[PDB]
Amino acid sequence: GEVINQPMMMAARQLHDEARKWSSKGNDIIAAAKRMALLMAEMSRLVRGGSGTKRALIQCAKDIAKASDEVTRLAKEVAKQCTDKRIRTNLLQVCERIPTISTQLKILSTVKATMLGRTNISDEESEQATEMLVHNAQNLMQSVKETVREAEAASIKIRTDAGFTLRWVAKTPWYQ
Amino acid sequence: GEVINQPMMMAARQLHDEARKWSSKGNDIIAAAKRMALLMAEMSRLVRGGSGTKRALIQCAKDIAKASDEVTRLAKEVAKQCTDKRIRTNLLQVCERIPTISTQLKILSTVKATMLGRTNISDEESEQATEMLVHNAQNLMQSVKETVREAEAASIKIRTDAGFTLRWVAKTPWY
Structure with a gap:
């Protein structure tokens, strides 16, 4: 049927949930976050393939x-x-982390892809390739979620009341 | 540190829940329905104010x-x-109520508006004004709900594609 890596889907789902709180209009970070969430959801469906x-x-x-x-x-x-000195510091922290994670995700996705449908690979080796990929994917989803929030806080103080600004407008929250 | 009118928020939410099932693209009814739900949601907050x-x-x-x-x-x-005669009757029946309800809403929300802040008004009078406004809000959200549903049904048997008719595409559920 529809076998799909739940830890990976979970993480995509939560990154999607954080981003869906904001309109994408006037906010490319929110749009890129929503894009990521969707791709990660697709990747959770790809890990199990031929x-x-x-x-x-x-x-x-x-x-x-x-x-x-x-x-x-x-x-x-x-x-x-x-x-803001502290907000800026936090923001800068993740803009350092994300590239490292994304580079590794590429490496790990490739190592996993060369193992798909190959019967000549160890059951432990493959399983570890998945775990490494899942762990990485989770770190990525986390860093991006954290980025969304620091950037929203950074829109409260802005410099020169001029230049660049992301639009931070909520899409109305209904209780569930 | 902030209250809302839960019955009005509920009514707003369930109009929204019906409308969100479809794309606003090629469907102005869905767009207007989504607009209403959002406004009705804001109104639930506005009822509790100074x-x-x-x-x-x-x-x-x-x-x-x-x-x-x-x-x-x-x-x-x-x-x-x-x-279809019966679907056309159901839709015209449902949607004809809407302008009178909306008008009663304009009347009752004006009543409530003049009572906001006002310490010289009875606590029963102010509670009743809210109950009247809430009840009306619910009738309005339900009618629109019913209209959206009946409009979707009326899109099935059309006029040999003759005039301008609405696009009923289910928004892909995020998964």
């Missing part, structure tokens, strides 16, 4: 990395204009 | 009424372009 899903998996990691780059790039620009 | 929220409440009601008028207008156009 030799045909190898290139699909490598590509998925790549597109995720492209989105991560955009989040990083925009967060730096938001930080450059942040007046 | 003299500063008076004009904000009157404005909201005016905006809800404007969206109601658009829903009715489009529903009536959908009904003319329909061939």
Whole structure:
């Protein structure tokens, strides 16, 4: 049926949940975050595949990395204009972390893709390749979630009342 | 540190829950429905306020009424372009109530607006004004709900693709 890596789906789902709180209009970070969440959800469906899903998996990691780059790039620009010393520090912390994680996600997605449908690989080896990928994916989803929040706080103080600003408008929260 | 009108929020939420199932693209009824739900949600907060929220409440009601008028207008156009007699009757029946409800909402929210802050008004009078406004809000949200549903049904048997008719595409559920 529909076998799919629950830890990976869980993490995508939570990154999606954090981002869906904001309108994407006037906020490219929010849009890139929503894009990531969706790609990660697809990747949770790819981990369980045959030799045909190898290139699909490598590509998925790549597109995720492209989105991560955009989040990083925009967060730096938001930080450059942040007046707040502590917020700016926190923002800058993740714009350092995300690129490292995204590079590793690419490596790990590739190592996993070369193992898909291959019967000549150890059951432990493959399982570890998954765990390493899942762990990394979780770190990525976390860093991005944290970036969304620091950048929202950084829009409270802005420098020169001029230049660059992300639009932080909620989409109305209903109780469940 | 802030209250809301839970019955009004509930009514707003369940109109929203029905509308969110579809794409606003090629469907102005869905767009107006989504607009209403959001305004009705804001109104639930505005009911619990001081003299500063008076004009904000009157404005909201005016905006809800404007969206109601658009829903009715489009529903009536959908009904003319329909061939099934009973579905056309159900839709015209449902949507014809909306303008009178919206008008009663403009009346009752004005009543409530003038009572906000005001310490010279009875506690029973102010409670009843809310109950009247809440009840009306619910009838309005339900009618719009019913209209959206009946408009979707009326899109099935149309006029040999003859006039302009609405796009009923289910928004892909995020998963």
